[PDB]
Amino acid sequence: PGAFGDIQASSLDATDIVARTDIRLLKPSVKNIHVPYTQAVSGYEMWKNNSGRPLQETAPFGCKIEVEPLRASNCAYGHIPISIDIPDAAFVRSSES
């Protein structure tokens, strides 16, 4: 209770919502009817206050980081070996050059 993750759900329109957030009731004193209570601070907005920097400006090697398939597109590291099967019709004779 009081950090990121005190609400859990499979999807957002599901029903198996599990949660603990320190909700404890209190005894009413005033003659008018209501119910008093107290509850911890929402840990989602407490994470949202000091989340830090995102990883679009913290990732090494300099790459755009897409979201919707979660790419890490277009950054540069190491060497990759390839091997090209060139078709032999695109060559010229040494008796021609």
């Binding site: 008018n32 009817i33 209501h34 920097r53 400006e57 913290t58 090494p60 090697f61």
Partner: protein, 311 residues
């Protein structure tokens, strides 16, 4: 699901801060405030239906009232007299059913109030409402030149949802002015031609229906019998200052209005910095007038990122 406002009724609330700075029962109690839009628009839920006449036939200049009375009836009044305030006046720009929407300056409380001169009232709660922006540069009002980022704002359309609410059967609501005790017994005084129940247990438990007939029994205290009006037809939201009925199960469901949707949203551009060249390092001489984010990172294996709001 449903949207029939000929079937639900407003109710009295218990507002913590009335006009005289004392908690009183008020028909203009607000219960939730939502402030997650990017345009400063809020969505207030009051306990008095807006945009409907007394039977609920949907004209856009009258609201149901749920008045104070010795009797127990609802009424109506003109829409022009509802003012929303946080730190100075602000601008109503939507209303449907319970809910309404306004764009209000940064303050600390949220006030709604009828301004009649006959039965004038108010109701405030505390809510840290303040000004927000979108993007990386801070601004006062949105510019006339810049990029177009996407910010999420509320619709002003009535018939769009993003919401869901539970609305169920009403509870028993006894009065003490249905009774008179001019002799050693007690007499039930119902209103003019109504079916009024009672559940009195002086000696042994009793019940029944009384229709404007002063009944007595073997009972000597003025407070040992209760009597409430028996209508049980309309529907009230589960606000925590009502008595539940002995059933208390879901009968209908209504629409929260004012969907939160995406939209394009203009942002400022800042003054591009001049750069001097020195050995393995830039020195960028740069100006701003409002807090504006700068971030840097290397392109190696250690990123070594910085970020600071410079003014």
């Amino acid at each position: 699901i449903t949207d029939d406002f000929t079937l639900t009724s407003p109710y009295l609330g218990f507002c913590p801060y009335c006009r005289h700075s004392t908690p009183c029962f008020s028909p203009i109690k607000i219960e939730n405030v939502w402030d997650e839009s990017d345009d400063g628009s809020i969505r207030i839920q009051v306990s008095a239906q807006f945009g409907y006449n007394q039977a609920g036939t949907a004209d856009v200049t009258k609201f149901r009232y749920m008045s104070f009375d010795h009797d127990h009836d609802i009424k109506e009044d003109s829409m022009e007299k509802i003012a929303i305030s946080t730190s100075g006046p602000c601008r109503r720009l939507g209303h449907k059913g319970y809910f309404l929407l306004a764009q209000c300056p940064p303050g600390d409380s949220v006030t709604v109030s009828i301004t009649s001169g006959a039965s004038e009232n108010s109701c405030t709660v505390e809510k840290k409402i303040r000004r927000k922006f979108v993007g990386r540069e801070e601004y006062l009002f949105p510019p006339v030149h810049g990029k177009l980022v996407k910010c999420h704002v509320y619709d002003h359309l009535k018939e769009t949802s993003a919401g869901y609410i539970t609305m169920h059967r009403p509870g028993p609501h006894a009065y003490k002015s249905y009774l008179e005790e001019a002799s050693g017994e007690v007499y039930i005084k119902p209103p003019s031609g109504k079916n009024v129940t009672y559940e009195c247990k002086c000696g042994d438990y009793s019940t029944g229906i009384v229709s404007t007939r002063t009944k007595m029994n073997g009972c000597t205290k003025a407070k040992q019998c209760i009597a409430y009006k028996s209508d049980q037809t309309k529907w009230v939201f589960n606000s925590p200052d009502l008595i539940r009925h002995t059933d208390h199960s879901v009968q209908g469901k209504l629409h929260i209005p004012f969907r939160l949707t995406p939209t394009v949203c203009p942002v400022p551009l800042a003054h591009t910095p001049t750069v001097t060249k020195w050995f393995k390092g830039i020195t960028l001489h740069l100006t701003a007038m409002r807090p504006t984010l700068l971030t840097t990172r290397k392109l190696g294996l250690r990123a070594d990122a910085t970020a600071e709001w410079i003014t």
